[PDB]
Amino acid sequence: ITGLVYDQRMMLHHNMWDSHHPELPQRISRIFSRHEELRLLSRCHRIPARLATEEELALCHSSKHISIIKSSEHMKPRDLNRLGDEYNSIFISNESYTCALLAAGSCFNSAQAILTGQVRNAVAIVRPPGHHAEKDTACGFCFFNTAALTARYAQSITRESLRVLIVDWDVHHGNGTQHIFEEDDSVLYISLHRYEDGAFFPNSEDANYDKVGLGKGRGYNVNIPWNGGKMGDPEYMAAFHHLVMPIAREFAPELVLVSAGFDAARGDPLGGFQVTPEGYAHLTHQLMSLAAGRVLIILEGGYNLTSISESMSMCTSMLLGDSPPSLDHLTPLKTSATVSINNVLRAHAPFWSSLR
Ligand SMILES: NCCCNCCCCCC(O)(O)C(F)(F)F
Numbered sequence: 001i002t003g004l005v006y007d008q009r010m011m012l013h014h015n016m017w018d019s020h021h022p023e024l025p026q027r028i029s030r031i032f033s034r035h036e037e038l039r040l041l042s043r044c045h046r047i048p049a050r051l052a053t054e055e056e057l058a059l060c061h062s063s064k065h066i067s068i069i070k071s072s073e074h075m076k077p078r079d080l081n082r083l084g085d086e087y088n089s090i091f092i093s094n095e096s097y098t099c100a101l102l103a104a105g106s107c108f109n110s111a112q113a114i115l116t117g118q119v120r121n122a123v124a125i126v127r128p129p130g131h132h133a134e135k136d137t138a139c140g141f142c143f144f145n146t147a148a149l150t151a152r153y154a155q156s157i158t159r160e161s162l163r164v165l166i167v168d169w170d171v172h173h174g175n176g177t178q179h180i181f182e183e184d185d186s187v188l189y190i191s192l193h194r195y196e197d198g199a200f201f202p203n204s205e206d207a208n209y210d211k212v213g214l215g216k217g218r219g220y221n222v223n224i225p226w227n228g229g230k231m232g233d234p235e236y237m238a239a240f241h242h243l244v245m246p247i248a249r250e251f252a253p254e255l256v257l258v259s260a261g262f263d264a265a266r267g268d269p270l271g272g273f274q275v276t277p278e279g280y281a282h283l284t285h286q287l288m289s290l291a292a293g294r295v296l297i298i299l300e301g302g303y304n305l306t307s308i309s310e311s312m313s314m315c316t317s318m319l320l321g322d323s324p325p326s327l328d329h330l331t332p333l334k335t336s337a338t339v340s341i342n343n344v345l346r347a348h349a350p351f352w353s354s355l356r
């Protein structure tokens with residue numbers, strides 16, 4: 001069976017100055033609603049949300065960071081505004097901390113359900129997102145790094161060296177996730193992201209292909225950066241075919257986490273890409289051949305309400321065992337994307353024998 005967690009309480013996090021800010025509360029209600037419409041919801045086993053504990057947060061975050069974000073809970077508006085503006089792209093309301101605890105806790109429960117064999121796989125319709133969050137700071141709509149925390153939680157209830165793969169197909173680089181695991185050979189981080197030579201958020205050259213990890217983590221950080229063109233299904237299918245999947249098989253994860261942002265989607269106001277729902281279905285389907293089907297799909301970004309609802313529903317459909325929808329005829333990829341994939345191929349060929 002396929003697990004699903006959703007809690008409307010996570011809608012409580014909101015922007016009291018700009019109510020039309022793209023990271024909307026209804027991002028999660030709309031995705032959930034689409035699951036009802038497509039009658040996918042009843043096919044799933046509902047997994048309860050819970051609060052992450054401060055101890056669980058400490059798995060990836062410093063006492064300082066946890067403490068300050070926690071304090072925002074009892075802050076007055078003007079102090080909330082001040083505190084948020086101290087970060088890169090953050091808004092805060094009195095409910096933000098709790099919502100971020102719920103987001104992470106929901107994912108812990110889902111990973112637990114997967115690892116105990118209660119479900120085979122699962123989707124987590126959560127917010128605020130997580131993958132920009134660093135050990136010591138909030139960033140890009142994220143407070144705590146949900147997927148990173150779920151990885152450590154997973155290892156904490158199995159064995160410390162449980163091989164976790166994190167595929168991050170949110171259109172932005174997960175800077176927080178890369179950094180948290182940069183010296184780690186037990187968590188393989190693979191991100192596809194619009195890069196534009198560092199001009200695309202989060203504007204750091206950390207996201208380039210030559211950042212392959214440090215220390216015993218060398219080779220266990222894979223950045224696939226897109227430059228120039230409007231990337232869509234063919235570019236992503238080719239990157240999975242040439243890079244993501246063979247690296248994944250060689251790594252042989254025991255658990256796959258998808259930092260599944262849907263802002264690379266056709267229609268997204270931010271991403272500028274054109275991955276279709278069918279595309280996301282095929283990416284999901286391929287990831288399902290890993291870790292004996294143990295896949296947790298975690299909502300990150302994505303800001304066209306219609307696009308993210310259709311896209312994530314299609315993923316859940318794949319996790320339920322539906323056959324992949326047919327892709328549009330795959331155009332020869334944009335020459336820029338070929339150059340990107342070759343750069344990664346050359347950068348990780350020394351660490352992965354499947355790449356040569
Ligand atoms: N003029 C400044 C534009 C800054 N734009 C911020 C984009 C944030 C993206 C967040 C995300 O989609 O990566 C997450 F997954 F975290 F939600």
Ligand SMILES: [Br-]
Nearest residue numbers: 022023089270
């Ligand atoms: Br923005």
Ligand SMILES: [Br-]
Nearest residue numbers: 036039041042
């Ligand atoms: Br239903």
Ligand SMILES: [Br-]
Nearest residue numbers: 200201270271
């Ligand atoms: Br952006």
Ligand SMILES: [K+]
Nearest residue numbers: 168170172192
């Ligand atoms: K990404």
Ligand SMILES: [K+]
Nearest residue numbers: 181184187220
């Ligand atoms: K790593």
Ligand SMILES: [Zn+2]
Nearest residue numbers: 170171172301
């Ligand atoms: Zn994003």
